[PDB]
Write a protein that holds these residues in place. Structure first.
Motif, PDB file in Angstrom:
ATOM      1  N   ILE A 147      45.829  50.877  37.696  1.00 19.39           N
ATOM      2  CA  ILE A 147      45.257  50.122  36.585  1.00 19.39           C
ATOM      3  C   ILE A 147      43.735  50.151  36.650  1.00 19.39           C
ATOM      4  O   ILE A 147      43.059  50.534  35.688  1.00 19.39           O
ATOM      5  CB  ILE A 147      45.792  48.678  36.588  1.00 19.39           C
ATOM      6  N   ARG A 148      43.172  49.753  37.791  1.00 14.11           N
ATOM      7  CA  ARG A 148      41.726  49.582  37.882  1.00 14.11           C
ATOM      8  C   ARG A 148      40.996  50.912  37.732  1.00 14.11           C
ATOM      9  O   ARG A 148      40.045  51.022  36.949  1.00 14.11           O
ATOM     10  CB  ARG A 148      41.368  48.911  39.209  1.00 14.11           C
ATOM     11  N   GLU A 149      41.428  51.936  38.469  1.00 14.03           N
ATOM     12  CA  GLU A 149      40.689  53.195  38.482  1.00 14.03           C
ATOM     13  C   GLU A 149      40.894  53.974  37.187  1.00 14.03           C
ATOM     14  O   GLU A 149      39.929  54.458  36.584  1.00 14.03           O
ATOM     15  CB  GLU A 149      41.111  54.039  39.687  1.00 14.03           C
ATOM     16  N   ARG A 150      42.140  54.100  36.739  1.00 19.93           N
ATOM     17  CA  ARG A 150      42.475  54.957  35.610  1.00 19.93           C
ATOM     18  C   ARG A 150      42.392  54.250  34.260  1.00 19.93           C
ATOM     19  O   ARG A 150      42.632  54.893  33.232  1.00 19.93           O
ATOM     20  CB  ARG A 150      43.879  55.550  35.809  1.00 19.93           C
ATOM     21  N   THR A 151      42.056  52.956  34.225  1.00 20.19           N
ATOM     22  CA  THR A 151      41.863  52.263  32.953  1.00 20.19           C
ATOM     23  C   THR A 151      40.695  51.285  32.943  1.00 20.19           C
ATOM     24  O   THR A 151      40.389  50.746  31.875  1.00 20.19           O
ATOM     25  CB  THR A 151      43.130  51.491  32.542  1.00 20.19           C
ATOM     26  N   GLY A 152      40.042  51.024  34.074  1.00 22.74           N
ATOM     27  CA  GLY A 152      38.901  50.134  34.103  1.00 22.74           C
ATOM     28  C   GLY A 152      39.218  48.664  33.952  1.00 22.74           C
ATOM     29  O   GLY A 152      38.298  47.841  34.020  1.00 22.74           O
ATOM     30  N   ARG A 153      40.478  48.306  33.743  1.00 21.78           N
ATOM     31  CA  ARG A 153      40.905  46.918  33.657  1.00 21.78           C
ATOM     32  C   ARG A 153      41.609  46.517  34.949  1.00 21.78           C
ATOM     33  O   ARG A 153      42.059  47.361  35.726  1.00 21.78           O
ATOM     34  CB  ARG A 153      41.832  46.714  32.456  1.00 21.78           C
ATOM     35  N   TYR A 154      41.697  45.212  35.174  1.00 20.25           N
ATOM     36  CA  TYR A 154      42.273  44.692  36.404  1.00 20.25           C
ATOM     37  C   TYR A 154      43.778  44.501  36.258  1.00 20.25           C
ATOM     38  O   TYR A 154      44.283  44.160  35.186  1.00 20.25           O
ATOM     39  CB  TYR A 154      41.605  43.373  36.790  1.00 20.25           C
ATOM     40  N   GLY A 155      44.492  44.726  37.359  1.00 15.97           N
ATOM     41  CA  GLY A 155      45.940  44.716  37.343  1.00 15.97           C
ATOM     42  C   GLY A 155      46.569  43.348  37.506  1.00 15.97           C
ATOM     43  O   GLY A 155      47.709  43.138  37.079  1.00 15.97           O
ATOM     44  N   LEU A 156      45.855  42.410  38.123  1.00 20.18           N
ATOM     45  CA  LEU A 156      46.405  41.078  38.336  1.00 20.18           C
ATOM     46  C   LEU A 156      45.277  40.112  38.664  1.00 20.18           C
ATOM     47  O   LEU A 156      44.164  40.518  39.010  1.00 20.18           O
ATOM     48  CB  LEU A 156      47.453  41.075  39.456  1.00 20.18           C
ATOM     49  N   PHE A 157      45.585  38.821  38.549  1.00 21.63           N
ATOM     50  CA  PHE A 157      44.642  37.752  38.843  1.00 21.63           C
ATOM     51  C   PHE A 157      45.388  36.643  39.568  1.00 21.63           C
ATOM     52  O   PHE A 157      46.401  36.147  39.069  1.00 21.63           O
ATOM     53  CB  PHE A 157      43.997  37.209  37.557  1.00 21.63           C
ATOM     54  N   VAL A 158      44.892  36.261  40.744  1.00 22.44           N
ATOM     55  CA  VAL A 158      45.433  35.133  41.497  1.00 22.44           C
ATOM     56  C   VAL A 158      44.262  34.410  42.150  1.00 22.44           C
ATOM     57  O   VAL A 158      43.580  34.979  43.010  1.00 22.44           O
ATOM     58  CB  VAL A 158      46.459  35.569  42.556  1.00 22.44           C
ATOM     59  N   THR A 159      44.032  33.164  41.748  1.00 19.91           N
ATOM     60  CA  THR A 159      42.842  32.445  42.180  1.00 19.91           C
ATOM     61  C   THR A 159      42.863  32.191  43.683  1.00 19.91           C
ATOM     62  O   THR A 159      43.921  32.071  44.306  1.00 19.91           O
ATOM     63  CB  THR A 159      42.719  31.112  41.437  1.00 19.91           C
ATOM     64  N   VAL A 160      41.667  32.110  44.261  1.00 14.70           N
ATOM     65  CA  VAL A 160      41.499  31.776  45.670  1.00 14.70           C
ATOM     66  C   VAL A 160      40.579  30.563  45.761  1.00 14.70           C
ATOM     67  O   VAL A 160      39.860  30.389  46.752  1.00 14.70           O
ATOM     68  CB  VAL A 160      40.937  32.965  46.470  1.00 14.70           C
ATOM     69  N   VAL A 161      40.586  29.743  44.718  1.00 18.61           N
ATOM     70  CA  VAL A 161      39.777  28.518  44.709  1.00 18.61           C
ATOM     71  C   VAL A 161      40.520  27.438  45.492  1.00 18.61           C
ATOM     72  O   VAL A 161      41.694  27.168  45.188  1.00 18.61           O
ATOM     73  CB  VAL A 161      39.495  28.071  43.267  1.00 18.61           C
ATOM     74  N   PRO A 162      39.898  26.835  46.504  1.00 16.75           N
ATOM     75  CA  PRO A 162      40.664  25.992  47.438  1.00 16.75           C
ATOM     76  C   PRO A 162      41.551  24.940  46.790  1.00 16.75           C
ATOM     77  O   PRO A 162      42.615  24.629  47.340  1.00 16.75           O
ATOM     78  CB  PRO A 162      39.562  25.337  48.286  1.00 16.75           C
ATOM     79  N   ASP A 163      41.161  24.382  45.644  1.00 17.03           N
ATOM     80  CA  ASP A 163      41.842  23.223  45.081  1.00 17.03           C
ATOM     81  C   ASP A 163      42.637  23.538  43.819  1.00 17.03           C
ATOM     82  O   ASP A 163      43.056  22.610  43.119  1.00 17.03           O
ATOM     83  CB  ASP A 163      40.823  22.117  44.786  1.00 17.03           C
ATOM     84  N   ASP A 164      42.869  24.814  43.513  1.00 16.75           N
ATOM     85  CA  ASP A 164      43.585  25.178  42.295  1.00 16.75           C
ATOM     86  C   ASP A 164      45.021  25.593  42.606  1.00 16.75           C
ATOM     87  O   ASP A 164      45.644  25.036  43.516  1.00 16.75           O
ATOM     88  CB  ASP A 164      42.833  26.288  41.556  1.00 16.75           C
ATOM     89  N   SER A 165      45.556  26.560  41.864  1.00 18.09           N
ATOM     90  CA  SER A 165      46.980  26.858  41.934  1.00 18.09           C
ATOM     91  C   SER A 165      47.368  27.407  43.302  1.00 18.09           C
ATOM     92  O   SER A 165      46.561  28.017  44.009  1.00 18.09           O
ATOM     93  CB  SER A 165      47.371  27.867  40.857  1.00 18.09           C
ATOM     94  N   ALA A 166      48.632  27.192  43.660  1.00 25.89           N
ATOM     95  CA  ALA A 166      49.188  27.656  44.921  1.00 25.89           C
ATOM     96  C   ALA A 166      49.899  28.997  44.793  1.00 25.89           C
ATOM     97  O   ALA A 166      50.573  29.417  45.739  1.00 25.89           O
ATOM     98  CB  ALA A 166      50.159  26.612  45.480  1.00 25.89           C
ATOM     99  N   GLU A 167      49.770  29.673  43.646  1.00 27.13           N
ATOM    100  CA  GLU A 167      50.401  30.978  43.480  1.00 27.13           C
ATOM    101  C   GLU A 167      50.113  31.888  44.668  1.00 27.13           C
ATOM    102  O   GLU A 167      51.016  32.557  45.182  1.00 27.13           O
ATOM    103  CB  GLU A 167      49.924  31.636  42.184  1.00 27.13           C
ATOM    104  N   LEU A 168      48.859  31.923  45.120  1.00 29.11           N
ATOM    105  CA  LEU A 168      48.520  32.735  46.283  1.00 29.11           C
ATOM    106  C   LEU A 168      49.238  32.224  47.525  1.00 29.11           C
ATOM    107  O   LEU A 168      49.826  33.004  48.283  1.00 29.11           O
ATOM    108  CB  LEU A 168      47.006  32.739  46.497  1.00 29.11           C
ATOM    109  N   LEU A 169      49.203  30.910  47.749  1.00 26.09           N
ATOM    110  CA  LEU A 169      49.916  30.342  48.888  1.00 26.09           C
ATOM    111  C   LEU A 169      51.404  30.657  48.808  1.00 26.09           C
ATOM    112  O   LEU A 169      52.042  30.945  49.826  1.00 26.09           O
ATOM    113  CB  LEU A 169      49.686  28.833  48.947  1.00 26.09           C
TER     114      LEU A 169
END
Ligand SMILES: [Zn+2]
Ligand SMILES: [Zn+2]
Length: 401
Positions: A147-169
């Motif tokens: 996605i990133r290399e061959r289209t310049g757009r990002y493939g996914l988003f998962v926040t790493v902000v300490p007090d936000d969503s736990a999707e990453l956790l």
């Protein structure tokens, strides 16, 4: 006489409150509900006003990790003694247990839940040369590369902000990482945990994640997907319906798919509960209100209007049957229907990966912070693991001596 707070509740769900609180008010004229809404942006403003008036809600909605944090300070009532017999048997057992703090008891009652899917922007996918979309975290790095290399757009988003969503956790748990042991000590200094820290450290350094994942929360993932700038988003039917009116075409390109799941195949459940603060002199009436809001009839209504899944076994089977009979005509109605069935059928192998565990929300802020430093090049992933372990065990040693 009854105070009901809805915290960070979408204003789209507002007409429903007037329809259920309408039912409660005519059913109980002598116990009318004073509804206070605290949507994003006015939460601090409203809470502080309540602090300055020394007033508290009788019923309020919380997620399990947050409830367990507030339960640690003695703020919530243990409801097991206030519940009528047979109530617990109305709810999904796995979900009812997730609302149980191991150290405080039944601090809340399950409400609605959502099994978030993988909303795949089929347009960016083909722009990168791909036909399938990834289904296991193993398959993500290569997908993010294309996605990133061959289209310049990002493939996914998962926040790493300490007090936000736990999707990453949650992703840690899916990849086989155990956060806390029995003694509430750190349990992620393991081969599975070091792989998880590095997995995300490498994706960011390689440049396959948006730079804002470390500075902004999951609300930016929704903004990016609407802009056609994100290839995959973790959400479900209700958001998909908003796209069909706001930024369509991105909707006409989206297809719901099973969520990114670990090697064990268990997806995540996002649980909303109702709790009764201990500073309440109508706790029995408050529990009556919480059980009313979360009964089969009301849950079935809400699950339809909000396009979520109920915690009531009765309402759940009704929603299922209401979907298996559904036969749409518009390709949009079939898109929304396809998403609600996916979440419903995925619910069997789905679990609340971060339940009402005391300290876990605090542990999240510790992990995300050291992880940020790792992906920003200050330290290594194996060093972020140790620093997070030492920093957590330092706290746990005083909280649970
Ligand atoms: Zn108990
Ligand atoms: Zn967030």
């Amino acid at each position: 006489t009854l105070q009901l707070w809805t915290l960070q509740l979408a204003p789209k769900f507002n007409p429903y409150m007037d329809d259920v609180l309408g039912s409660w008010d005519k059913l109980h004229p002598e116990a009318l509900v004073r509804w206070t809404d605290l949507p994003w942006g006015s939460v601090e403003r409203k809470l502080l006003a309540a602090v300055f008036a020394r007033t508290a809600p009788d019923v309020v909605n919380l997620n399990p990790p947050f409830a367990a944090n507030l339960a640690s300070k003695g703020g919530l009532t243990d409801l097991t003694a206030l519940l009528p017999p047979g109530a617990e048997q109305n709810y999904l057992p796995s979900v009812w247990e997730a609302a149980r703090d191991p150290e405080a008891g039944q601090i809340a009652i399950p409400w609605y839940l959502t099994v978030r899917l993988s909303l795949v922007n089929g347009d960016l996918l083909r722009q990168a040369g791909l036909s399938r979309a990834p289904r296991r975290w193993d398959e993500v790095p290569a997908y993010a590369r294309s996605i990133r290399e061959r289209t310049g757009r990002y493939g996914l988003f998962v926040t790493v902000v300490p007090d936000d969503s736990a999707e990453l956790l949650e992703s840690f748990v899916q990849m086989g990482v155990s956060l806390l042991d029995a003694r509430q000590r750190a349990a992620f200094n393991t081969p599975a945990g070091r792989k998880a820290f590095a997995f995300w450290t490498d994706l960011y350094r390689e440049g396959l994640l948006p730079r804002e994942v470390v500075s902004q929360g999951q609300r930016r993932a929704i903004e990016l997907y609407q802009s056609g700038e994100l290839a995959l988003l973790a959400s479900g039917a209700e958001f998909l319906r908003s796209i069909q009116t706001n930024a369509p075409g991105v909707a006409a390109v989206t297809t719901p798919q099973p969520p990114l799941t670990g090697s064990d195949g268990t997806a995540n459940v996002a649980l909303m509960t109702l709790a009764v603060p201990r500073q309440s002199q109508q706790a029995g009436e408050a529990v009556e209100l919480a059980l009313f809001l979360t009964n089969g009839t009301n849950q079935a209504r809400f699950a339809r209007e909000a396009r979520v899944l109920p915690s009531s076994l009765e309402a759940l089977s009704a929603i299922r049957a209401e979907l298996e009979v559904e036969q749409p005509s518009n390709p949009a109605e079939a898109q929304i229907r396809d998403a609600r069935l996916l979440s419903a059928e995925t619910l069997n192998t789905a679990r609340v990966l971060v339940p009402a565990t005391p300290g876990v929300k605090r542990l999240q802020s510790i992990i995300y912070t050291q992880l940020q430093r790792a992906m920003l090049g200050q330290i290594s992933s194996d060093q972020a693991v140790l620093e997070a372990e030492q920093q957590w065990n330092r706290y746990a040693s005083a909280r649970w001596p």
